[PDB]
Design a protein around this ligand. Structure first.
Ligand SMILES: [Zn+2]
Ligand SMILES: [Zn+2]
Ligand SMILES: [Zn+2]
Ligand SMILES: [Zn+2]
Lengths: 133, 49, 596
């Protein structure tokens, strides 16, 4: 798999058809479209199953390059859950002027900048997925 | 009354004054942490592009 | 939000919010501000309002300090005292607050409207903090006035240079001027994007006008045009540094002798090395920007800043400057916005070179040894204060001549500004003189330098080449045949119907005239381009046909007449019912019905 691909929706639908054809209830690969909470559980279960196939680097925050007062940033605009598929933020604005306290907080708290401005790391003391030092 | 009610005037003036001093301190440290956050963001950004 | 009183400078956190800019007043000062004028709204770090719901009473004089908040007379707690008492409003630092009685000029500036001359008169002759406050208030007021304007939708984009722009409905259209720069807005449907900044100009006719833009991103028919804006920023640096004379060169390391043509200027460079700051008067065409480049070469081991106001001004400073000077240069002013193409030489942001040609409004954080400022006929106290706030050099020199035209200042409708009350630099350079005069002019003809010396000047500047063909054919002005409220002196042009053939070597002459309408109506039936002196402060012309207008003082201004003659090389003519102006100007007087 290429490093940049992160959608992975039709693959889930095709696996669902290949292995569970005659299951008699709808299945939304992206739980954003679910109805009530019971459909959320029903679809998150299959997502838990299928997400053990795809590469592990393609999970976590989705970042993108935004500008404020002529300065390029790197902030996150969504996620890619192992259970709830892909989620996109609704209120995102490129080209800003100034940031007030609220936005300063939500930008300083993201791991996007911290990880994008750090050295790669390969920790062999563990087996969990490392990210950056 | 002129011996006690004015002491109540004094206590209320003093508590309002102290509260508004502490509020001034709140807004001051507010501006300070704001400056700190933004300088940290800028210096972190200047290492990636 | 604690600060020093704008009158007595005792620590305070009091402001009267009804005043537009909200300055720091002491307890006494704020009391005087609230009992006398209409600012019946006072605020400390917390607002002073009846905190009762439904009771929105405003003035503090009808408030009473309650348990924790301030309440009105009605919803008052039984145990409460007022907030206006013994001449001090209830706030911080009650006992160390000193106040004074200078509340007079304070109310004068806090209650003025800037629509008259006398307001600007007082704003120029008040105390330092009062002067900065007046500057701030008038800048905020002109910002709100410009924002009181509106939009301008495009009818047709003829070209990148010719534009058909109609303005808002039921709205006073902004005149064809260079100062009002227009930002463009084109909505997808959905997302209105800023399409850049654009400048306009009166065309050769109507309604298609000439215009220039910062971008090749061309316009469209649905775009709408509004003038750009911002917010007025506070200032803390004073207007002018005090004078400091020095008995010896204060670190100023000169050159040996390199271009001895600047010997008449080294006698002034030594003086600039002898003091902290000074002023220089360079008439149009005199040793102006040559003086400064000679100062640059003579002291080549010191960081120097050059500054102006307009992009045309900083470019007229930039021209001959790249000649006498190694390059090895820097003059970086505008990173993202010059409506007209500005500097195109080297980088945007490194402060690389020791000489920099910039503008006051766009000066970055730089340090130097002197900042030589031209065009002091157009700067205000605000530009002086931001010069002092942006540059902290070892020397300063204000170059310029007050006999030129002032700032627009559209709000002035009752009266006119004398340059002595234009700004502080002009006040000093006309009360004590520029204390450093440079002579003489060399470009203009001598017949418009010695004959024009008799007017606002004192017969001290000179030039050469008196010949030829400089005659004033005084026509008797006819009735005002105006279409727009601006007068059309077509009878005055009645002296020019028989002029296109009798002038053999004069076909590329220039029709100049004060009124924009008088330039336009001439441009209808034209034979040569038109350019009013407002578009020219950095332009030279060989021939010129100055056309005057009605007997009003708007036409008989010695300042504009001066600045309108000094843009010629060979000849110029005066066509005016002049009763006394031709007595100080000694050429041959001609009459219109006679061709000699
Ligand atoms: Zn579902
Ligand atoms: Zn006020
Ligand atoms: Zn005071
Ligand atoms: Zn009330």
């Amino acid at each position: 798999w290429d490093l940049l691909k992160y959608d992975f929706t039709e693959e889930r639908l095709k696996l669902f058809d290949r292995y569970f054809k005659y299951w008699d209830q709808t299945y939304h690969p992206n739980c954003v479209n679910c109805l009530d909470d019971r459909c959320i559980l029903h679809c998150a279960n299959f997502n838990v199953l299928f997400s053990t196939v795809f590469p592990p680097t393609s999970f976590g925050p989705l970042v993108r390059k935004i500008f404020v007062d002529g300065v390029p940033f790197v902030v996150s605009t969504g996620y890619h859950f192992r259970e709830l598929g892909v989620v996109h933020n609704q209120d995102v604005n490129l080209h800003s002027s100034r940031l007030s306290f609220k936005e300063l907080l939500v930008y300083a708290a993201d791991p996007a900048m911290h990880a994008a401005s750090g050295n790669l790391l390969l920790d062999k003391r563990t087996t969990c997925f490392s990210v950056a030092a | 009354r002129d011996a006690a009610m004015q002491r109540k005037l004094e206590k209320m003036a003093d508590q309002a004054m102290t509260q508004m001093y502490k509020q001034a301190r709140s807004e001051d440290k507010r501006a300070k942490v704001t400056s700190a956050m933004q300088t940290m963001l800028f210096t972190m950004l200047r290492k990636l592009d | 939000a604690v600060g020093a009183c704008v009158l007595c400078n005792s620590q305070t956190s009091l402001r009267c919010g009804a005043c537009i800019r909200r300055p720091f007043l002491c307890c006494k000062c704020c009391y005087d501000h609230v009992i006398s004028t209409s600012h019946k709204l006072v605020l400390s770090v917390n607002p002073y309002v009846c905190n009762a719901p439904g009771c929105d009473v405003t003035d503090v004089t009808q408030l009473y300090l309650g348990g924790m908040s301030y309440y009105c007379k009605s919803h008052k707690p039984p145990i409460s005292f007022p907030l206006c008492a013994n001449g001090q409003v209830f706030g911080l630092y009650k006992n160390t607050c000193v106040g004074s009685d200078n509340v007079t000029d304070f109310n004068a500036i806090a209650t003025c409207d800037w629509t008259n001359a006398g307001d600007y008169i007082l704003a120029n002759t008040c105390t330092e903090r009062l002067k900065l406050f007046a500057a701030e208030t008038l800048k905020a007021t002109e910002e709100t006035f410009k924002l009181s304007y509106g939009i301008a939708t495009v009818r047709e984009v003829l070209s990148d240079r010719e534009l058909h722009l109609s303005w808002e409905v039921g709205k006073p259209r902004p005149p064809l001027n260079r100062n009002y720069v227009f930002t463009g807005y084109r909505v997808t449907k959905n997302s209105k994007v800023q399409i850049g900044e654009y400048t306009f100009e009166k065309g050769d006719y109507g309604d298609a006008v000439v215009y220039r833009g910062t971008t090749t991103y061309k316009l469209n028919v649905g775009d709408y045009f509004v003038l750009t804006s911002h917010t007025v920023m506070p200032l803390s640096a004073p207007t002018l540094v005090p004078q400091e004379h020095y008995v010896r060169i204060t670190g100023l390391y000169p050159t040996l002798n390199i271009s001895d043509e600047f010997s008449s200027n080294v006698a002034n460079y030594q003086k600039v090395g002898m003091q902290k700051y000074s002023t220089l008067q360079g008439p149009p065409g005199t040793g102006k920007s040559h003086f400064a480049i000679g100062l640059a070469l003579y002291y080549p081991s010191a960081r120097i800043v050059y500054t102006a106001c307009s992009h045309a001004a900083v470019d007229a400073l930039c021209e001959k400057a790249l000649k006498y000077l190694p390059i090895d240069k820097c003059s970086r002013i505008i990173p993202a916005r010059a409506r007209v193409e500005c500097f195109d030489k080297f980088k945007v942001n490194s402060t690389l070179e020791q000489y920099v040609f910039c503008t006051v409004n766009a000066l970055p954080e730089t340090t130097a040894d002197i900042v030589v400022f031209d065009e002091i006929s157009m700067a205000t106290n605000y530009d002086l204060s931001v010069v002092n706030a942006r540059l902290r050099a070892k020397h300063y020199v204000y170059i310029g001549d007050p006999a030129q035209l002032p700032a627009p200042r559209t709000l002035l409708t009752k009266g006119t500004l004398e340059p002595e009350y234009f700004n502080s630099v002009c006040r000093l350079m006309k009360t004590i003189g520029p204390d450093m005069f440079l002579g003489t002019c060399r470009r203009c003809p001598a017949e418009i330098v010695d004959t024009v010396s008799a007017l606002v000047y004192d017969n001290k500047l000179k030039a050469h080449k008196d010949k030829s063909a400089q005659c004033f054919k005084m026509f008797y002005k006819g009735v005002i045949t105006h279409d727009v409220s601006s007068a059309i002196n077509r009878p005055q042009i009645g002296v020019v119907r028989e002029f296109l053939t009798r002038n053999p070597a004069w076909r590329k002459a220039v029709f100049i005239s004060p009124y924009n309408s008088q330039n336009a109506v001439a441009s209808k039936i034209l034979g040569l381009p038109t350019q009013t002196v407002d578009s020219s402060q950095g332009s030279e012309y060989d021939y010129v046909i100055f056309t005057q207008t009605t007997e009003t003082a708007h036409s008989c201004n010695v300042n504009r007449f001066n600045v309108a003659i000094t843009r010629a090389k060979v000849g110029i003519l005066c066509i005016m019912s002049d009763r006394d102006l031709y007595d100080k100007l000694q050429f041959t007087s001609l009459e219109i019905p006679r061709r000699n």
